[PDB]
Write a protein that binds this ligand. Structure first.
Ligand SMILES: [Ca+2]
Ligand SMILES: [Ca+2]
Ligand SMILES: [Ca+2]
Ligand SMILES: [Ca+2]
Ligand SMILES: [Ca+2]
Ligand SMILES: [Ca+2]
Ligand SMILES: [Ca+2]
Ligand SMILES: [Ca+2]
Ligand SMILES: [Ca+2]
Ligand SMILES: [Ca+2]
Ligand SMILES: [Ca+2]
Lengths: 846, 845
């Protein structure tokens, strides 16, 4: 009958793509009919949908660009007045009447193309491409700082300041819109570390990192975290896999970036289940160690009587600045002082902050490799984002291994054996060894021992026999120190009486960071307990590198003093000097059990010989490849190697984030995850294997006497498949509004991917809360610090959604996708579920 | 008779150099006797002094290096066992008794040298040089971040993180020491901007910049600032110079970096003398505009009913980002939205934050020059500090002038005329013009006009005749806007009825930033008050540059619409487009006097046509040369040119900081000052001239109808000559303790230069406080925000000292100079002035 058939077949979701009642220019809809000429109109079936952009545009300008793009991409018909020449002079200043005329004729030429191919598929590509040319309909309008003037890439590989926060919006003003289903009374952001009570922001630790940031201030979320944690502490049991395949504790990821209440609550759950507060015997069996690069966390943990191990990142920087650099190395004395533990004369217990320390972790390998890529692509701003490429990393790796075998290294660490020698002999710490320093981490899992394997395992194994007792570190000259442990039960170097175990243990580590250091003879006080004793050299420096096979027998005088002679070397392994001496009669195990030290009734963790006896092993690398068979699954190899890890004195196996990875994430490593409860199936493996294989790995490790921790990731999820209309504001990592190249936006409706969770969340979300409330009522009557209320188990989270999220890093969708009428009213589809406004549609559809 | 004569001739200041009782390894003392051979000793005269470093050292290792350094610099005698081979094997592990034996023989050899020549002059240089090799006795021990791993230089030219703060130290522990004369109960640092009350650090604005930071939280200092301000407000009268040579108000330097009590009290003073609060007629005659690069100051000043003008630094960034960049210019639209004032349809009065705005100031020119220097010397960390050289700056200037003349500019601003076109036509601001944009600022003052003189002054003069009424800005395309003023007394574009002054004023500025923009015709709404009216093009673009002599007569239709045709151009002056139209029958002055607009009884400054009638002129460049004659003094030239400034419509003459410069400061410009009250004498000229010459410049400017502001500089002084023993901690510019390459220090005695002030401070410090206290008692009963205490005029500051200071930027002296005994007790000289400890000297002394 007429062109009114452009109107939607119905004014509801059955005919009009929408998201919570809002329309998107990228949406499609089913009109009543279509037409290849103005004269004949065919009604649409239920399978005939058309892009909204054929009918509506955000401005007359975009409408002109729509015409101009399609005409120049094959949709011209001089009979209808459409050709490159006929449309080149159209602009926003053309009368509205004419432009619509032209637009109405273009649809005809489109339907012509649709009919010839019997398909909208080519048209779909042309719409998608064209959208890419319009900033407000594509990602550019999100104002990534990557495109800002003078932006430099960050070798972390992510973009701290590309964020939007989810804000409440219950407006009755249709120009502002209404997303009340996504409203929240919580979203208390930056309640991080000492700002848990919002009254001390001295750590300045940001809430937003990457992905969908989880609102860990919401009591229903806080309840779900406990459900999740409880699931993982019983993983094998609750999954009917190996009944001994359960995690014992947690590596807490991004503990500087979540509401700190959830640290209290994870440590409360483990105390409720296992009785850890005031009982180091039990607490040492359920380690919780927090990832952090903020020194203030050590204040907080000491304040809370140490519910979690603090990460001694200051010492990592010390290690790299003093020993790792090529030149301009820092004062050798800083190794004595620049850590959470001053180790000049560490001759006490229960005084240091319980802490874990490292030479490398998976993030520090990431930063260095990314740096290599950045160096090979100067002036390319998107090299770590939209212009990131795997092949660049492959090339940086070939550079990394080649640089690693050099003496004058360009990118890799100098003095890595000395670094580990100090780590594995320091008192008052739980040291952590990195998988990628033992194995070449891009090859299949544990298939290539690195150049540093022999030296580190030599030190790891020696720690079991020699590292106990007091500690003393002495600066010998400007580039040379000794660090001495006195042996089991020996408090200090003036102790004369000891038992057999102490007598035959203790250790001297000698470290220099001047490759030109003059030959010279030094005196090492080993302690009165070690007078007239035979020592051998566990590990020494030779021109080509390192030896563990010096057959000399060294002797202490009647004062426990050992004289050795040391000089500077320069080789792939040592830039300076490295030398380690242990008692000749030694070898017996000297680890301390919790029942041999005095329990501290007012601490969870307490820094002493028992806790010191522990060794954490980071079991993965982000650059670990995908396996090509069942036998290359990390879980399976880990099961078969449980005894090797125990031989090395590892007691605490930090296992990779096991969760189902978003399949387009950069490393497939598990932090970018779609499902917190699905740790792999036969049909859908993770990089590491299947959940059943995980439960066997954990069981094998327990059988070798080790405890296992899971990377608990409360900060964010990535890869949700469902969109919600959310009101957002462009912010920085700290959730403060951000202006980019003079532009910003606030309180705008955004079609973010926010709803999902997988079958894992559907079937296990909230499943144990009733059981937890029965067994542990305290978890749901203890008021959280930041909120003043207890975790709320009366709601189960079976599917995530924006009401449970603080915001998201930019998703590359664009900010002007929501359709707005000429007067600025949002278009809207009213029905039973969506009652924010009356139905309000563009004229062409209405 | 023997080595006991090494002891000091007396255990007091008469024979031992010291600072407040503390001894320095760099000091000298008079021993009782000296000897060349260990056998004969000659007693010393009053003139026979020896360096302490010949007798005492901070460690055995430095004693070793002292021996080794002097033997290898010509103090060798094999008869005395001193030769290069005889000393190379010494080390801190040599027995102390032997090293002291060796050191005693070295003195004999030193004394041999001292007798051969008849002088300790060569020994002085050897000592001085030697100290340069010991980190703990020289500047490296200060932990300058310039030397840190990975340091990059800052084109500001200073080092924000090289600071120490002065802390209280009244200890009876001789290992901690005692500097209680330097104690204070104030030193409330970072009470800056919105953190005046200590409860809102959201601006995060640091206390420490450079030099000796003045503790503007101290009530005695606050009272002295009032004394100073009152002196400057009466400069010519109180100096018996020209009786009309007095400043009228202030540009306030580093307003973001001083306790904000001090902004209140300068506004209070102006109000007490001149009755400015609630009276814009008086207030506009006594402008106080605040230097600021922090947006948070706009809120503070709005909260305080605008006692000072806010500095619209946001808009300056917008100007450089949208128009001045070579490429990737920001959205033209930002010129409408990105300033303290949104100018889409600015059709109101008394709403906007009273503000001053600029295209350039002397600090932005400096950052750019330094950046040229840094580009010219990549990878050199000290290039802006110890490695700074004027010759590099000379080279940068040859580059600046050459690049300025290019079309493809590498360093200088694109579209500078259009920037000033927008600045000088914007409503709701007091615009500020930069001296260095009208003149080639490295030449003698005003001797050389720049390439931009004709254009800026054309717009400047035009403002007198055309710029008034409401404002509308309209984005025409992605790279092109019009900004329009409707003329005197015309509120908006819909007003139809107006007097003759309105009919013949108003102005259209058309600004494009796309040099390849297509030729196109545009419509400009001039307002219903401007229908059927002839227009002339005041300033336009031509292929080679700018015209202001287009003879074309343009006409508006019956709605006030002006149709012009514009395109993109590319030449040294325009990258994009610039075009300016005004009514043909215009020319009459249209500035507004305070009495024509409604006074705001609850504001000091209010943003309306009278405030908008003012124009600030920054009179100086840091790179101004030294004059070579009397005729070349900036003051003398300013007096001869007062009519020029008023012809340009300048009403507010921002005068350079007139204080006596520290004679080795970088620009000699007056911010690095030794004397706050001495603005130049005939025998000791500042760069700009003599105080008497300044008074005649001010009077000439007044004679031309201008008001004159002095750059008021309360943040810091530099160049004190008196040292004090002060207890310091290494900090960043926010007074937070800092670690550098893993090192820090805290509560350490430092021999800082902190005492001075000049005769100006002696003869005028506190001089008017009795007068002020009787005239304006409120100044000394109003309690300051930060301290809850009124300024205290019962102590006069006639000499500055560390008790009146927050701290200092690193003075490049060293931190381990104070002499420490083996047990860590500080050495000390007890006399009638210094009673912190018993006298306690090294054993040799
Ligand atoms: Ca977070
Ligand atoms: Ca992390
Ligand atoms: Ca229990
Ligand atoms: Ca994949
Ligand atoms: Ca991104
Ligand atoms: Ca360095
Ligand atoms: Ca600064
Ligand atoms: Ca200050
Ligand atoms: Ca300044
Ligand atoms: Ca010149
Ligand atoms: Ca010139």
């Amino acid at each position: 009958a007429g062109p009114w058939e452009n109107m939607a077949y119905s004014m509801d979701s059955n005919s009009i793509n929408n998201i919570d009642g809002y329309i998107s220019y990228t949406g499609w809809y089913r009109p009543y009919g279509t037409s290849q000429d103005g004269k004949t109109w065919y009604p649409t079936t239920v399978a005939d949908w058309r892009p909204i952009l054929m009918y509506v545009w955000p401005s007359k300008d975009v409408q002109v660009k729509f015409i101009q793009y399609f005409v120049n991409h094959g949709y011209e018909n001089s009979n209808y007045g459409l050709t490159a020449g006929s449309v080149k002079d159209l602009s926003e200043n053309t009368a509205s009447i004419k432009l619509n005329e032209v637009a109405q004729n273009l649809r005809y030429v489109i339907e012509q193309h649709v009919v010839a191919a019997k398909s909208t598929s080519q048209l779909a590509n042309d719409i998608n491409n064209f959208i890419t040319t319009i900033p407000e309909l594509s990602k550019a309008s999100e104002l990534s700082v990557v495109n800002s003037y003078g932006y430099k890439p960050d070798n972390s590989g992510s973009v701290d300041d590309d964020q939007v926060i989810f804000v409440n919006n219950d407006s009755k003003n249709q120009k502002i819109g209404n997303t009340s289903y996504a409203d929240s009374n919580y979203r208390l952001m930056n309640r991080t570390i000492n700002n848990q009570n919002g009254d001390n922001n001295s750590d300045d630790s940001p809430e937003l990192l990457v992905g969908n940031d989880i609102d860990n201030s919401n009591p229903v979320v806080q309840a779900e975290n406990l459900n999740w944690e409880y699931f993982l502490l019983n993983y094998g049991k609750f999954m009917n896999y190996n009944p001994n395949g359960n995690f014992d504790g947690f590596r807490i990821d991004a503990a500087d970036n979540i509401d700190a209440d959830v640290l209290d609550q994870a440590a409360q759950l483990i105390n409720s289940i296992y009785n850890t507060k005031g009982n180091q015997a039990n607490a040492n069996d359920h380690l919780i160690y927090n990832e952090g690069y903020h020194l203030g966390a050590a204040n907080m943990l000491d304040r809370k009587s140490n519910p979690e191990l603090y990460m001694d990142s200051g010492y990592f920087y010390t290690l790299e600045n003093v020993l790792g650099r090529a030149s301009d190395r820092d004062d050798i004395n800083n190794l004595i002082t620049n850590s959470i533990v001053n180790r000049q004369n560490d001759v006490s217990e229960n005084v240091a902050t319980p802490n874990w320390s490292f030479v490398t972790n998976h993030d520090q390998r990431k930063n260095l490799i990314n740096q290599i890529v950045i160096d090979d692509h100067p002036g390319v701003a998107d090299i770590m984002s939209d212009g990131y490429k795997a092949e660049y990393v492959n090339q940086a790796w070939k550079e990394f291994y080649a640089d690693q075998a050099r003496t004058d290294k360009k990118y890799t660490q100098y003095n890595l054996p000395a670094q580990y020698a100090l780590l594995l002999t320091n008192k008052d710490t739980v040291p952590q060894v990195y998988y990628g320093d033992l194995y070449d981490e891009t090859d299949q899992y544990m298939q290539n021992k690195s150049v540093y394997y022999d030296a580190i395992t030599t030190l790891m194994k020696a720690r079991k026999s020699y590292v106990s007792g007091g500690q003393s570190m002495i600066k010998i000259n400007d580039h040379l120190l000794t660090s001495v442990r006195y042996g089991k039960g020996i408090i200090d170097g003036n102790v004369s009486m000891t038992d057999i175990l102490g007598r035959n243990s203790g250790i001297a580590v000698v470290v220099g960071n001047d490759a030109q250091m003059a030959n010279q003879t030094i005196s090492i006080n080993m302690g009165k307990a070690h007078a007239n004793q035979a020592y051998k050299q566990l590990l020494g420096t030779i021109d080509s590198g390192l030896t563990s096979s010096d057959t000399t027998i060294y002797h202490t005088d009647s004062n426990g003093v050992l004289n050795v002679t040391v000089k500077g070397y320069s080789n792939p392994y040592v830039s300076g000097y490295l030398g380690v001496w242990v008692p000749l009669n030694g070898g017996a195990n000297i680890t301390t059990k919790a029942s041999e030290v005095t329990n501290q009734s007012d601490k969870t963790y307490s820094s002493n010989a028992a806790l010191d006896s522990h060794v954490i092993y980071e079991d993965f690398s982000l650059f670990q490849p995908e396996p090509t068979s069942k036998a290359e699954h990390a879980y399976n190899i880990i099961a078969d190697n449980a005894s090797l890890f125990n031989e090395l004195g590892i007691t605490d196996f930090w296992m990779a984030p096991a969760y189902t990875p978003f399949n387009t994430s950069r490393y497939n490593e598990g932090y970018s995850m779609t499902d917190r409860y699905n740790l792999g199936t036969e049909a859908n493996l993770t990089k590491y294997g299947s959940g059943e294989e995980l439960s066997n790995a954990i069981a094998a490790l327990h059988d070798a006497g080790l405890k296992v921790q899971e990377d608990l990731v409360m900060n964010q999820m990535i890869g949700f498949s469902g969109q919600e209309a959310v009101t957002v504001t462009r912010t920085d990592g700290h959730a403060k509004q951000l202006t980019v190249d003079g532009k910003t936006f606030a309180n705008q409706i955004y079609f973010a991917y926010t709803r999902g969770g997988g079958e894992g969340q559907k079937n296990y979300g909230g499943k144990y809360l009733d059981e937890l409330q029965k067994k542990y009522p305290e978890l749901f009557t203890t008021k959280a610090v930041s909120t003043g209320v207890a975790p709320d188990p009366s709601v189960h989270i079976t599917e995530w959604s924006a009401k449970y999220q603080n915001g998201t890093s930019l998703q590359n969708i664009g900010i002007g996708l929501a359709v707005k009428l000429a007067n600025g009213d949002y278009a809207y589809l009213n029905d039973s579920n969506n009652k924010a406004f009356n139905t309000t549609l563009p004229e062409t559809m209405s």
